Amino acid sequence: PEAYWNREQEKLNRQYNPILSMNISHLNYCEPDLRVTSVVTGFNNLPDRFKDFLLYLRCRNYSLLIDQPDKCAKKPFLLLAIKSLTPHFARRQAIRESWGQESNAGNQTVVRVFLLGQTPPEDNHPDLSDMLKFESEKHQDILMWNYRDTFFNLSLKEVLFLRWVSTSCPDTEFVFKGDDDVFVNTHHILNYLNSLSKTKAKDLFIGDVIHNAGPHRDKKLKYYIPEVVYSGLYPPYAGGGGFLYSGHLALRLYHITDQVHLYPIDDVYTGMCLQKLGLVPEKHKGFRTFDIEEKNKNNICSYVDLMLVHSRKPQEMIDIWSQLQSAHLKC
Ligand SMILES: *[C@@H]1O[C@H](CO)[C@@H](O[C@@H]2O[C@H](CO)[C@@H](O[C@@H]3O[C@H](CO[C@H]4O[C@H](CO)[C@@H](O)[C@H](O)[C@@H]4O)[C@@H](O)[C@H](O[C@H]4O[C@H](CO)[C@@H](O)[C@H](O)[C@@H]4O)[C@@H]3O)[C@H](O)[C@H]2NC(C)=O)[C@H](O)[C@H]1NC(C)=O
Ligand SMILES: CC(=O)N[C@@H]1[C@@H](O)[C@H](O[C@@H]2O[C@H](CO)[C@H](O)[C@H](O)[C@H]2O)[C@@H](CO)O[C@H]1O
Ligand SMILES: *[C@@H]1O[C@H](CO)[C@@H](O)[C@H](O)[C@H]1NC(C)=O
Ligand SMILES: *[C@@H]1O[C@H](CO)[C@@H](O)[C@H](O)[C@H]1NC(C)=O
């Protein structure tokens, strides 16, 4: 394949699959992979995020700076894992106060972690470390690893989180992974999980699943991917705004990540890992990752049969949550 990622992924496949039979690590090589400047045509004219992605692609052994090791001391029914960024204090607090509160109704334990990388001063981020410690001490729901938290490193956020599940929360029945700007009807998710047979629950993976997508080739677009980096279609994948899957599948996904090179778009990467597992993510109508009709955004009854809606501001998540608590009496 002319495209770099495809070409390197095929090499991964043959080293994991003897049937294809007829040398730096791809997992813990953390010096720059200088070969990429020779083999990627036009490397020097690529945007900086692509250069950094290609150079350090073979490094994923980053450590936890802030951990909450007893977060799953009690076997959770549902683990909420919310991708966030250091400066988003308001987003995390609104989630804490609304749909992301930890609870134990009916002995079905819901626990919450926020997933962060570093926002270092060398990348011109303002220094908010003392406030992050303060937040972490008080609320004990911050997981932070020491990699550069960037758009193109969100696959790392995925792999490192899945590594944390296998080491520190392997008994959770279900996992919800989402962004910090979505509203999530946590009651409706609990009801949905309790209506699942165990056969169906075993390999559960549902979201707003996208079929037959391809890399955007427009150089101005957020999700632009040049032809020299990737070719072909994307596998089916749930939009990263939020998806829901079993803890048993989380263990299997973690194991399979070693066999899939990181990809700059994190929700495609999870789709690549599912496909390698022989699984197809399941589209569920309750995931509105492109939001609902504006006429309906007003009426709280519009949110009752929803799993999640993107996107909502901190104030709106709290307001929707408060109205939702009395939704059974007027809908
Ligand atoms: C995902 O997250 C990971 C982890 O945080 C990021 O990986 C880091 O990427 C940064 C670059 O953004 C790396 O830092 C760079 O290292 C280069 C090479 O350093 C080695 O070689 C020099 C010389 O041989 C040695 O002195 C050095 O000690 C190392 O042995 C530097 O050349 C880089 O630039 C430096 O000089 C330039 C001048 O052009 C200055 O502008 C810079 O500020 C800097 O001083 C830079 O230091 C870092 O090593 C990576 N960390 C790890 C653990 O691998 C990914 O970048 C990130 N991915 C995305 C897409 O964001
Ligand atoms: C079939 C098709 O092309 N559908 C597109 C979606 O791919 C696209 O979704 C976004 O895609 C990027 C990767 O390119 C990233 O995964 C985002 O999370 C995901 O939302 C959507 C918006 O570009 O449009 C659909 O038409
Ligand atoms: C990953 O492991 C290698 C080999 O043990 C080591 O050289 C490297 O520093 C590690 N990377 C990080 C980010 O710790
Ligand atoms: C919940 O668990 C407690 C043990 O802590 C048990 O005594 C109780 O019967 C359980 N209640 C329900 C409704 O499951």
Numbering used by the authors: 55 to 76, 89 to 397
Wording from the paper:
β1,3-N-acetylglucosaminyltransferases (B3GNTs) are Golgi-resident glycosyltransferases involved in the biosynthesis of poly-N-acetyl-lactosamine chains. They catalyze the addition of the N-acetylglucosamine to the N-acetyl-lactosamine repeat as a key step of the chain elongation process. Among the characterized B3GNTs, B3GNT2 is the major poly-N-acetyl-lactosamine synthase, and deletion of its coding gene dramatically reduced the cell surface poly-N-acetyl-lactosamine and led to hypersensitive and hyperresponsive immunocytes. The luminal domain of B3GNT2 comprises an N-terminal helical domain (Pro55–Cys125) and a C-terminal catalytic domain (Cys138–Cys397) as well as an extended linker (Arg126–Lys137) that connects the helical domain to the catalytic domain.
By soaking B3GNT2 crystals with either the donor substrate UDP-GlcNAc or the acceptor substrate LacNAc, we were able to obtain B3GNT2 structures (B3GNT2_UDPGlcNAc and B3GNT2_LacNAc) in the substrate-bound states. The acceptor substrate LacNAc (Galβ1-4GlcNAc) is bound to the top of the cleft and more solvent exposed. The Gal ring for the anticipated glycosidic bond formation reaction is located close to the center of the cleft, whereas the GlcNAc ring is close to the solvent. The hydroxyls of the Gal ring are engaged in direct hydrogen bond interactions with the side chains of His282 and Asp333 and water-mediated hydrogen bond interaction with the side chain of Tyr300. The Gal ring is also stacked against the side chain of Tyr289. In contrast, the GlcNAc ring is only involved in a water-mediated hydrogen bond with the main chain oxygen of Gly280 through one of its hydroxyls. And superposition of the B3GNT2_UDPGlcNAc and B3GNT2_LacNAc structures shows that the acceptor substrate LacNAc binds right above the donor substrate UDP-GlcNAc in the substrate-binding cleft. The hydroxyl group on C3 of the Gal in the acceptor substrate points to the C1 of the GlcNAc in the donor substrate at a distance of 3.7 Å. The Asp333, which is 2.7 Å from the hydroxyl group on C3 of Gal in the acceptor substrate LacNAc, serves as the active site base and abstracts the proton from this hydroxyl group. Ala279 from the β5-β6 loop is less than 4 Å from the acetyl group of the GlcNAc of the acceptor substrate.
